A = this chain, B = another copy of it.
């Protein structure tokens, strides 16, 4: 049976600082996760695994530790926060108080100044989903907002639930599409 493995890049430097977006590299234990992922994947004994990543350094660097070849997709790049790129939440509240308030109102269609909305994100992920459907075993190393969009599709979630789906770091979600829907398994790689 085919299984789709979904996970995020290992812990980035900006993740450690509590800052959003950007294009930073993996931290120390972020790299230890890349190694732990390589171990888990091997132990899965998956037949002909296709591996996808984004153009962002953090995803690429995580895939490198696997040894096997992978492919890069621009459409898998993290959601653009626009002007709020690399800010902490406190900084967004202080410098864009009205914008921050509008988000909680409708997290699905809200756009930061010159940024993307979850709706924009779902649109550019359409082709990524179409390919995913016509594949067998695949591992997608992406980002939190991207993972939420892909996960919503497979676990059949609404536009309301989507922006709030649980997608923590160092955790792999093994989704097995079945006739009644989709089975899920969560594997936490403690590093």
Binding site for B on A (CB under 8 A): 11, 15-19, 88-90, 93-94, 97, 100-101, 104, 164, 166-171
Contacts and interface: CB of A to CB of B under 8 A. Distances in A.
Contact of A97 (B16, B19, B88, B168): B168
Nearest to A96: B168
B89 A170 contact: no
Taking the full assembly, how many copies of this chain does it contain?
2
A90 B166 CA distance: 11
A93 B166 contact: yes
A15 B90 contact: yes
Contacts of A16: 88
Given A17-B17, A18-B18, A164-B104, A171 B94 contact: yes
Contact of A89 (B89, B93, B164): B89
A155 to B, nearest CB: 14
Given A104-B164, A164-B104, A169 B90 contact: yes
Contacts of A90: 11, 15, 18, 168-169
Given A15-B88, A93-B167, 11 more contacts: A15-B90, A17-B17, A18-B18, A18-B19, A18-B88, A18-B89, A90-B169, A93-B169, A97-B171, A100-B166, A104-B164
A3 B100 CA distance: 27
A46 to B, nearest CB: 25
A167 B90 CA distance: 10
A34 B93 CA distance: 19
B18 A168 contact: no
18 contacts: A11-B90, A15-B90, A16-B88, A17-B18, A18-B18, A18-B88, A18-B89, A90-B168, A93-B166, A93-B167, A93-B168, A93-B169, A94-B168, A94-B169, A97-B168, A97-B171, A101-B166, A104-B164
